Design an enzyme around this catalytic site. Sequence first.
Site, PDB file in Angstrom:
ATOM      1  N   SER A 128       0.851  -1.197   0.000  1.00 55.09           N
ATOM      2  CA  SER A 128       0.000   0.000   0.000  1.00 55.09           C
ATOM      3  C   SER A 128       0.888   1.249   0.000  1.00 55.09           C
ATOM      4  O   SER A 128       1.682   1.406  -0.917  1.00 55.09           O
ATOM      5  CB  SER A 128      -1.001  -0.093   1.123  1.00 55.09           C
ATOM      6  OG  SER A 128      -2.103   0.785   0.888  1.00 55.09           O
ATOM      7  N   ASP A 174     -10.088  -4.547  -4.253  1.00 51.81           N
ATOM      8  CA  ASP A 174      -9.617  -3.353  -3.545  1.00 51.81           C
ATOM      9  C   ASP A 174     -10.154  -2.050  -4.175  1.00 51.81           C
ATOM     10  O   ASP A 174      -9.995  -1.851  -5.373  1.00 51.81           O
ATOM     11  CB  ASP A 174      -8.102  -3.364  -3.698  1.00 51.81           C
ATOM     12  CG  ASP A 174      -7.287  -2.432  -2.835  1.00 51.81           C
ATOM     13  OD1 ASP A 174      -7.866  -1.446  -2.321  1.00 51.81           O
ATOM     14  OD2 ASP A 174      -6.063  -2.726  -2.715  1.00 51.81           O
ATOM     15  N   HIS A 205      -8.073  -5.388  -0.089  1.00 50.03           N
ATOM     16  CA  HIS A 205      -6.888  -4.562   0.066  1.00 50.03           C
ATOM     17  C   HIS A 205      -5.880  -5.210   1.005  1.00 50.03           C
ATOM     18  O   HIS A 205      -4.690  -5.134   0.740  1.00 50.03           O
ATOM     19  CB  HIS A 205      -7.255  -3.173   0.601  1.00 50.03           C
ATOM     20  CG  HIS A 205      -6.068  -2.298   0.728  1.00 50.03           C
ATOM     21  ND1 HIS A 205      -5.334  -1.898  -0.360  1.00 50.03           N
ATOM     22  CD2 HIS A 205      -5.513  -1.740   1.819  1.00 50.03           C
ATOM     23  CE1 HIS A 205      -4.330  -1.164   0.075  1.00 50.03           C
ATOM     24  NE2 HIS A 205      -4.441  -1.030   1.388  1.00 50.03           N
TER      25      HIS A 205
END
Length: 263
Positions: A128, A174, A205
């Site tokens: 991320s 996601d 995610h």
Amino acid sequence: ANPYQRGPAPTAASVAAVTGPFATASVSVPRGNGFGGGVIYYPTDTSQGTFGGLAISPGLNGTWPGIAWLGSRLASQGFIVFGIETNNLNDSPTSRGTQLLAALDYLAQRSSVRSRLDPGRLAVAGHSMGGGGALDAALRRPSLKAAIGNAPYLPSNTLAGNRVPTLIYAMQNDTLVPPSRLTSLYNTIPATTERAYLEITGAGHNYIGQPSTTLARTMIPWLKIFIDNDTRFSQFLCPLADQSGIRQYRSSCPLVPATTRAL
Ligand SMILES: [Ca+2]
């Protein structure tokens, strides 16, 4: 022979295994030297020579334990893997990039395992905002051998001018970092830069928060090819030998390691 080649001839089973052919150890690193410290995982066998290195960053509000399964699983294939903590939980993507580079510098210059490392053969990864960090690091330090972004949030969403071989994972479901964003990102990578894009079926995610064979068995080849020049692992990605758990695969196969620096 390839002087950076390590470990037996691989198989589908060997790259998918929870622990690879090398016995491993780890050491904790406390906060300091530009980042939050973390854990260094490494092979204990020195008889085949030094190993390349990978630094890995969590995302926003993340700590290394949340993704620490990567440490021994990747190291046991023959890598020094530094999972980091950030200075602050709310550190930015470019900050995570800074701290990955600081972690690699510490690994090479000051760590207790520096004698096991080849400081010319280093890579970055993250999840991320930590994946965004890894990509930003690659843009800043073109001598890096590889970058791996898992659902990477790069604020610019552009890798124009990136020379570092880059693997991007997208999580099908996601919406923080949607596949559509990551498709656009992949498409900015220069044509002359080796690259790959893998969309994971049915993943949210934070899929990476649990151990994933699908991730491990595609990451391990990438690291071997680009960190070690080890084209024994090309057979896993060119073409993709097992598509289990993968919705979409794009890459610049054949995947050719970078040329050696000019004498
Ligand atoms: Ca190619």
